[PDB]
Amino acid sequence: GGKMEKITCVGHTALDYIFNVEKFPEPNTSIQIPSARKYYGGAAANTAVGIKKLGVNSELLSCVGYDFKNSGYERYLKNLDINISKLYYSEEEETPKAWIFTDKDNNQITFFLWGAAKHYKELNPPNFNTEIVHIATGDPEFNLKCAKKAYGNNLVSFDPGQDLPQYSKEMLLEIIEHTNFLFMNKHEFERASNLLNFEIDDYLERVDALIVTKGSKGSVIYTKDKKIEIPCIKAGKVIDPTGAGDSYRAGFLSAYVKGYDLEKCGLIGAATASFVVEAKGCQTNLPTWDKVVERLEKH
Amino acid sequence: GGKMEKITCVGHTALDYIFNVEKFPEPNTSIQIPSARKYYGGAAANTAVGIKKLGVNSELLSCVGYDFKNSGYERYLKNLDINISKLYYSEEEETPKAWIFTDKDNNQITFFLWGAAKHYKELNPPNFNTEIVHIATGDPEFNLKCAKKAYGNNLVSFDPGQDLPQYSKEMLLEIIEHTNFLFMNKHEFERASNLLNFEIDDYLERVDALIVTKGSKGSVIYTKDKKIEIPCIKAGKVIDPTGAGDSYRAGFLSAYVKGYDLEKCGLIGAATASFVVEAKGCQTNLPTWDKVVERLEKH
Ligand SMILES: [Mg+2]
Ligand SMILES: [Mg+2]
């Protein structure tokens, strides 16, 4: 049939570390970083936490490591009442991590430790009883299994994100054919469209809504019937843009479950993203529902 | 007076992590690393462990973090009978770490998390009762305090290493004036000599032995009386060159304490270095004394 008032987020739960260096080192040189704070991250977790903060029950499906057990992150999620019953805990691998070296002018070079994500290929998705299954970056093969199992039962939301290069023409077409809400940033949309030889109408033969996000230039929602332009919502002061995308999706999907029309979903996504960019870390300044509604009332 | 049959190593104790990536990422891209093994490291610790493996009692003076306590590294050092009574344990900071991203052609870009090394400026050196105080990379101000306190009591060994750029003409002259054995790699020697306007004889007015290491082209020992050429000792197969320098110093200083002439000290240093380069990690393939003597017997 169809399922309950909740959203499942599938994909990375990770610890993000931002290392403030002066200059990237040339061969046979040692530069340093004073300290490196850890932030709770991972696209799936970011989205799940944002959804929960907006008053919608979320559940998380990720592979975590031996250093997740009893650690800051686990207690943090338990304290937020996020259902983590579906987490796979690895005995051998550590939790996925992103080690981000950033310079003095603010140019970022990153890295992603796969770690316990190696386990996705050993696993198969459970049945989902949620209204929406949102598939964020993770293991593409497992993500396709999730889309193909959920589609026609749960609404499927998908954003290929930085995983996009790993999808062949054929595999991308397959997951999109099992997607209800397809989110892509503009660069990724152009790349996907060139790969698929798709125009907008080709996506809309397969999905219910295509949402192209353009950051500071807003977003656009395309359906069969309509093109909806969503403005960017002005933040107070941009400290960290990293969590913005996941937070827009968190807001959009939360609004959808809460029963608003797609335009309002877009506006809530935009308003949500405007909060997260005000602080460092993808989950640090996630807003409540009433705070997001209040900000849209001003803008 | 003078002191006992032991060597104090001052400076970094660190955890080294080598991350095997495909290509360094361009702006707004996510590449990955499958896993990242941890190796026991830090120039001071590397040297102390190498010394101990050669049958000479060593002690370590480093600032370590809250994640050192009870961790792999602490038990490992205790099990090797390395005196770690002088370690400073930080409550607030983590242990220094080196995060080394390496590519497919084998080009390395590195980073050094300062962490608990912030505490050196809060501390002052104890009296040392050892025959040699070896001062490796660390906090230059604390290192100078160590040299100035030890000189004329303990023999002082010093290598500015990758810290060399942090020393002004004046500060470098000062620590060298309190050094008995000065080690430098050739590039660092040329840089130091240009900065100081020193020729070899200028060093020798201040130090007892200047040891210039040239890796695969061997090393040279200069004293007032003599120039001693030390060949490189052929290894089996070079897997990791990272630990080679510290191991040469470990061998050289161990031989010195064991009462051999400087030429033999050089040869032992060379032979020791030939073992460490055969495996990944700076301490993983550290040889015993008899094994080092045996290898020189062949070469
Ligand atoms: Mg269809
Ligand atoms: Mg003098």
CATH for B189: 3.40.1190.20
Tokens encoding B18: 């080598």
Dist CA B49 CA B183 (whole Å): 18
Does the beta-carbon distance from A29 to B162 stay under 8 Å?
yes
Does the beta-carbon distance from A32 to B187 stay under 8 Å?
no
Nearest chain B Cα distance for residue A258, angstroms: 33
Residue in A276, A223, A220 with CA at minimum distance from that of residue A245: A276
Residue A61 bridge partners (DSSP): A10
Tokens 């386990």 — which residue? A119
Neighboring chain B residues of A101 at a CB cutoff of 8 Å: 111
Question: Given CB atoms, is B109 within the 8 Å cutoff of chain A?
Answer: yes
Around Cβ B21, how many Cβ atoms within 10 Å?
17
Tokens 């969503």 — which residue? A230
Neighboring chain B residues of A25 at a CB cutoff of 8 Å: 109-111
Dist CA B184 CA B208 (whole Å): 14
**Residue of chain A whose Cα is closest to the Cα of B98:** A32
Residue B53 bridge partners (DSSP): none
Q: Which of A32, A101, A113 sits opposite B114 (nearest CB)?
A: A32
* DSSP one-letter string for A208-277: SEEEEE-GGG-EEEE-SS-EEEEPPPP-S--S--TTHHHHHHHHHHHHHHTT--HHHHHHHHHHHHHHHT
Q: What are phi and psi of B236, to 5 degrees?
A: -75, -50
3-state secondary structure at position B62: coil
Tokens encoding B21: 């990536």
Which are the contacts of A279, defined by CB distance < 8 A and separation ≥ 6? A239, A240, A285
* DSSP one-letter string for B71-83: SHHHHHHHHTT-B
Tokens encoding B191: 């840089």
- Domain count across chain B: 1
Does the beta-carbon distance from A30 to B99 stay under 8 Å?
no
Residue in B18, B10, B194 with CA at minimum distance from that of residue B84: B10
Dihedral of alpha carbons B155, B159, B160, B162, sign: negative
Dist CA A57 CA B186 (whole Å): 63
Residue A102 annotated as lining a ligand binding site: no
CA B100 to ligand 1 centroid distance, Å: 46
Which are the contacts of B29, defined by CB distance < 8 A and separation ≥ 6? A110, A162
Dist CA B217 CA B205 (whole Å): 26
Q: Decide: B159 and B32 in contact? Cβ < 8 Å.
A: no
Question: Given CB atoms, is B4 within the 8 Å cutoff of chain A?
Answer: no
Around Cβ A224, how many Cβ atoms within 10 Å?
10
CA A149 to ligand 1 centroid distance, Å: 14
Question: Given CB atoms, is B19 within the 8 Å cutoff of chain A?
Answer: yes
Dist CA A152 CA B118 (whole Å): 57
Residue B58 bridge partners (DSSP): B7
Taking chain B, what is the end-to-end CA distance rounded to the nearest angstrom?
39
Ligand lying nearest the CA atom of residue B156: 2
Dist CA A216 CA A247 (whole Å): 14
Q: Decide: B19 and A113 in contact? Cβ < 8 Å.
A: yes
The half-sphere exposure of A208 on its side-chain side, counting CA atoms within 13 A, is 12
CA B211 to ligand 2 centroid distance, Å: 17
Quote the distance between the C-alpha of residue A158 and its chain's center.
9
Tokens encoding B196: 């100081």
Dist CA A171 CA A183 (whole Å): 17
Neighboring chain A residues of B35 at a CB cutoff of 8 Å: 93, 113-115
Which are the contacts of B104, defined by CB distance < 8 A and separation ≥ 6? B22, B23
Dist CA A14 CA A137 (whole Å): 11
| Per-residue b or e along A253-268, where b marks 16 or more CB atoms closer than 10 Å to that residue's CB | bbbbbeeeebebbbbb
Ligand lying nearest the CA atom of residue A202: 1
Tokens encoding B118: 């912030």
Which structural domain, as residue segments, surrounds residue B277? 1-299
**Residue of chain B whose Cα is closest to the Cα of A20:** B113
Residue in B55, B52, B57, B68 with CA at minimum distance from that of residue B12: B68
Tokens encoding A68: 């997740």
Neighboring chain A residues of B101 at a CB cutoff of 8 Å: 111
Dist CA B142 CA B135 (whole Å): 10
